Paper text:
The [name] protein of human (HIV) and simian (SIV) immunodeficiency viruses is an important replication and pathogenicity factor. [name]-mediated internalization of [name] from the surface of infected cells is highly conserved among primate lentiviruses and thought to promote the release of fully infectious viral particles and to prevent superinfection. [name] stimulates clathrin-mediated endocytosis of [name], [name] and other cellular receptors by acting as an adapter of the adapter protein machinery. Our study thus provides insights into the molecular basis for the versatility of [name] as an adapter protein for the internalization of surface molecules containing endocytic sorting motifs.
We were able to improve the crystal structure to 2.50 Å resolution by using an N-terminally truncated [name] [name] starting at M87 before the extended acidic cluster in SIV [name]. As before, a synthetic peptide of 16 residues comprising the cytoplasmic dileucine motif of [name] was added to the crystallization screens. Again, the sorting motif of one [name] molecule in the asymmetric units contacts the hydrophobic crevice of another [name] molecule. In this structure, the electron density map was visible for all residues in the dileucine-based sorting motif, providing detailed molecular insights into the interaction of [name] with endocytic sorting motifs. Additional density of a helical conformation is visible in a solvent channel between both [name] subunits. This sequence could not be unambiguously assigned as only the main chain of two helical turns is defined. Upon binding to the hydrophobic crevice, the [name] sorting motif of [name] [name] forms a regular α-helix (αL) of two turns ranging from E188 to M195, thereby ending with the last canonical residue of the internalization motif. The negatively charged hydroxyl side chain group of E190 aligns between the two positively charged guanidinium ion groups of arginines 137 and 138, forming two strong salt bridges in the assembly between the sorting motif and its recognition domain. L194 binds central to the hydrophobic crevice with contacts formed to G128, L129, I132 and R138 of [name]. Of note, no water molecules were seen in the binding interface between [name] and the sorting motif, indicating that the side chains of L194 and M195 sufficiently fill the hydrophobic crevice.
Author numbering:
A (entry chain B): 104 to 233
B (entry chain A): 107 to 183, 203 to 233
Amino acid sequence: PKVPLRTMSYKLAIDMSHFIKEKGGLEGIYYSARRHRILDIYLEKEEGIIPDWQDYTSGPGIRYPKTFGWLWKLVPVNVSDEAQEDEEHYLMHPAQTSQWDDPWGEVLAWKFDPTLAYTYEAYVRYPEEF
Amino acid sequence: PLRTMSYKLAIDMSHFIKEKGGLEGIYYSARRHRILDIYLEKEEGIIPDWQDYTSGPGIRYPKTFGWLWKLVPVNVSWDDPWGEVLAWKFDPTLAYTYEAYVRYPEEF
């Protein structure tokens, strides 16, 4: 039936990290609050993961996942050339995020990082965010 | 991972694009043609050998069976060798009729 709820432990975070990768992964997909909550619902629905686990550090640059074992961090994506990323947008995806949705103005995309299983960067670098 | 544009892929990419703002009603140009080429080469690794449209005056039909987009003239009363403004129009019946090959097999 429905998977019983369970919190994302360290081992579960790794297994879910690879489960999402095997499902195609999130590489290079642009981050967003809506995509964030969609990811949350996907793991509750298919795997019963209580969705109190997906959070990222806030400083500029890499946004490290605050649950240790989650291997999908956020990275800033480089400036889009004036020509022709705006014509590309009109042509294909006319509905764009505003970069100032992020407090640092940075456009964020998911990136996979296996080393995040061996260093809890979020807590090692920014303990004050806990 | 370059992959070539199959029928099922053309259907899906047709739908993905149409789902979003997509190409609907947008003025066609040789520039915008290549931009679409790149955006698909990059975002899905599709060799850009698929997006051709039949030549003559009138509606231009896509030469990849499964690509659900054609080019339609806009009434008004230039880039086009026939003297027409062209616009992208989604058309789901191209899933079931290879109009390009039916009407103009010459171009194959």
